[PDB]
């Protein structure tokens, strides 16, 4: 237990975070000097190549060494909160992995996030043959999400619905444990999180295979059944209709990728809001969120550098306003 201890280690690892200047600096650079830049940071410690595969292997290895430990570092009660905080994006990593195995995109491409499972386990999961094999390989290290994926696979067997149903059941279990814990900032964060998941899964359906309430999930704070059911149709202006809550900041309708960008940005901002409570959870919350945003930016910048893609399109992504 003893959040103060976990919080001490978190505050130490927050010092080696990558300052904001680094992103705009590497925004316009060549891949050799980009690799240089990454060599100067903490991620250097595991960078053992010059090509993009090794760069991203290093990024994932360091995010795992530096975040995927936080569960194992604490026990008792704070382990529950941190395990929630990681299991969320572990779910999201498995979700993206399912969507990848759908379109056959190679595992080296599917964006992974800092989770409690290491790299090679997800490598197996995609190298596994069929979703049931994914469930089994995830059950090997005893993942509290494996059995959920299994129990949901036995019903839908369609990737369009199984991912959101899995999200529903997982949020049920873990919001249960969280309400058990009753921490203020953590509860507000779970609220923002389930709301974000709702607003994404709304954009992901767009009329096809409709179920305007079978895909919803309770526990939200700012979105609701009515606005969700709206976005269950092809409408898009349902966003500024929600003008008070922070999700008005999105203030736009570009694309699923841009919607996900905006949600990641607003969630990172609301987590940044949670720094001013050291002896608690808000700190480690903000640190893990900043670290996953850091990883995503490293991805979207190594991508651009290696492929020589123009500076403008990724400049649109770097700011996170």
């Amino acid at each position: 237990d003893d959040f103060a201890y976990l919080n001490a280690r978190v505050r130490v690892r927050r010092g080696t975070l990558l300052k904001e200047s680094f992103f705009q600096e590497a925004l316009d650079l060549s891949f050799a000097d980009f690799l240089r830049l990454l060599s100067e940071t903490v991620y250097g410690g595991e960078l053992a190549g010059q090509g993009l595969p090794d760069v991203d292997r290093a990024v994932l290895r360091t995010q795992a060494k530096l975040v995927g430990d936080l569960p194992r570092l604490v026990t008792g009660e704070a382990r529950e909160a941190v395990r929630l905080l990681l299991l969320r994006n572990d779910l999201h990593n498995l979700q993206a992995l399912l969507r990848a195995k759908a379109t056959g995109r190679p595992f080296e491409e599917v964006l992974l996030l800092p989770g409690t499972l290491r790299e090679e386990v997800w490598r197996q999961a995609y190298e596994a043959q069929d979703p049931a094999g994914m469930a089994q390989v995830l059950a090997v290290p005893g993942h509290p999400l494996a059995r959920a994926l299994r129990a949901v696979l036995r019903e839908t067997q369609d990737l369009a619905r199984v991912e959101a149903l899995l999200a529903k059941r997982f949020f049920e279990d873990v919001a249960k444990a969280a309400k058990g814990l009753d921490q203020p900032a953590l509860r507000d964060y779970l609220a923002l999180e389930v709301d974000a998941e709702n607003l994404r899964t709304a954009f992901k359906l767009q009329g096809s295979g409709l179920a305007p309430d079978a895909f919803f999930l309770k526990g939200g704070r700012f979105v609701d059944r009515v606005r969700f059911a709206r976005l269950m149709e092809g409408d898009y202006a349902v966003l500024d209709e929600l003008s008070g809550t922070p999700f008005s900041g999105l203030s736009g309708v570009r694309d699923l990728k841009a919607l996900e960008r905006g949600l990641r940005c607003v969630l990172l901002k609301e987590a940044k809001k949670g720094v001013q409570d050291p002896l608690g959870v808000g700190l480690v919350l903000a640190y893990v969120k900043e670290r996953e945003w850091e990883a995503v930016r490293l991805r979207l910048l190594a991508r651009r550098a290696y492929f020589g893609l123009p500076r403008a399109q990724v400049e649109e992504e770097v700011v996170c306003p």
């Binding site: 237990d1 003893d2 026990t75 008792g76």
Partner: peptide
């Protein structure tokens, strides 16, 4: 109290 909590957790690891 805290010592035992941490010890039981460690053993469980």
């Amino acid at each position: 109290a805290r010592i035992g909590a941490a010890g039981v957790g460690a053993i469980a690891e």
